[PDB]
Design a protein around this ligand. Structure first.
Ligand SMILES: N=C(N)NC(=N)NCc1ccc(S(N)(=O)=O)cc1
Ligand SMILES: [Zn+2]
Length: 258
């Protein structure tokens, strides 16, 4: 009875096996744009992805994920609210059954069709496992997806999805450039939070970009053809793999922009 997104194993059940689900620093959250405070002390974010080395793409039964070579400082996130250097290790997405839902974060209660998470770890802790347990160990760059014009830099991803339809399947996925997934503006909101799946560790500095990327209907429809189930199990489409907004509690969301 492993965690998932169904009626019997979804977000409202997670606290039983991961009690921090009811913690003080859980993610995602609703971003109230009129309560978020502009912080003139914040730096421009530095997203340095030119030397990224993608390795493989996997369906893990909860999303699909592209792993990167993080054995040296190839693709890093710096600046903004961060102190030190954060190495890109993986990206994945959350998405909906319909275009009107799918994001984890919301903006003035608005849901987007999907949300991209670029996951980074603080190099001062040496490896991602150790970093994941530290209060300033991880930084997730979150990017909203809306449906409209196609995103050309996403097409290589959606064309490989037919090869990883079911849980446990992986494929080679070298030479993918994550710069092709970024919007024009790096304006962002930031707040201290958590992983949005089990184990829900409260170890993430969230950086959520204000500007969504557009993807086509055809692109997001291909996400929805993935399966939660393994090969030779009854088919259950991988859709609505998002955690709802959690209580903000004693946190302030800061804006990088006026
Ligand atoms: N359940 C796991 N395999 N997850 C794990 N340890 N990966 C850690 C992990 C990384 C990022 C995110 S997210 N959605 O906040 O960006 C969730 C979980
Ligand atoms: Zn995520």
């Amino acid at each position: 009875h492993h965690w998932g997104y169904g009626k019997h194993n979804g977000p409202e059940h997670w606290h039983k096996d991961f009690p921090i689900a009811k913690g003080e620093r859980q993610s995602p959250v609703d971003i109230d744009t009129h309560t978020a405070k502009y912080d003139p002390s914040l730096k421009p974010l530095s997203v340095s992805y030119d030397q990224a080395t993608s390795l493989r793409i996997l369906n893990n039964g909860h999303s699909f994920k592209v792993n990167f070579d993080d054995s040296q400082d190839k693709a890093v996130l710096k600046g903004g609210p961060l102190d030190g250097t954060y190495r890109l290790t993986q990206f994945h997405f959350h998405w909906g059954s319909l275009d009107g839902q799918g994001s984890e974060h919301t903006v003035d209660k608005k849901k987007y069709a999907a949300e991209l998470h670029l996951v980074h770890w603080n190099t001062k802790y040496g490896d991602a496992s150790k970093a994941s347990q530290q209060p300033d160990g991880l930084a997730v760059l979150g990017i909203f997806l809306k449906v409209g014009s196609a995103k050309p830099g996403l097409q290589k991803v959606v064309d490989v999805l037919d090869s990883i339809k079911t849980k446990g399947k992986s494929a080679d996925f070298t030479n993918f450039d994550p710069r092709g997934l970024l919007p024009e503006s790096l304006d962002y909101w930031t707040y201290p939070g958590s992983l949005t799946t089990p184990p829900l560790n409260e170890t993430v500095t969230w950086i959520v970009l204000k500007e969504p990327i557009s993807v086509s209907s055809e692109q997001v429809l291909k996400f929805r053809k993935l399966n939660f189930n393994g090969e030779g199990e009854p088919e259950e489409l991988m859709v609505d793999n998002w955690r709802p907004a959690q209580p903000l509690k004693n946190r302030q969301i800061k804006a990088s922009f006026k």
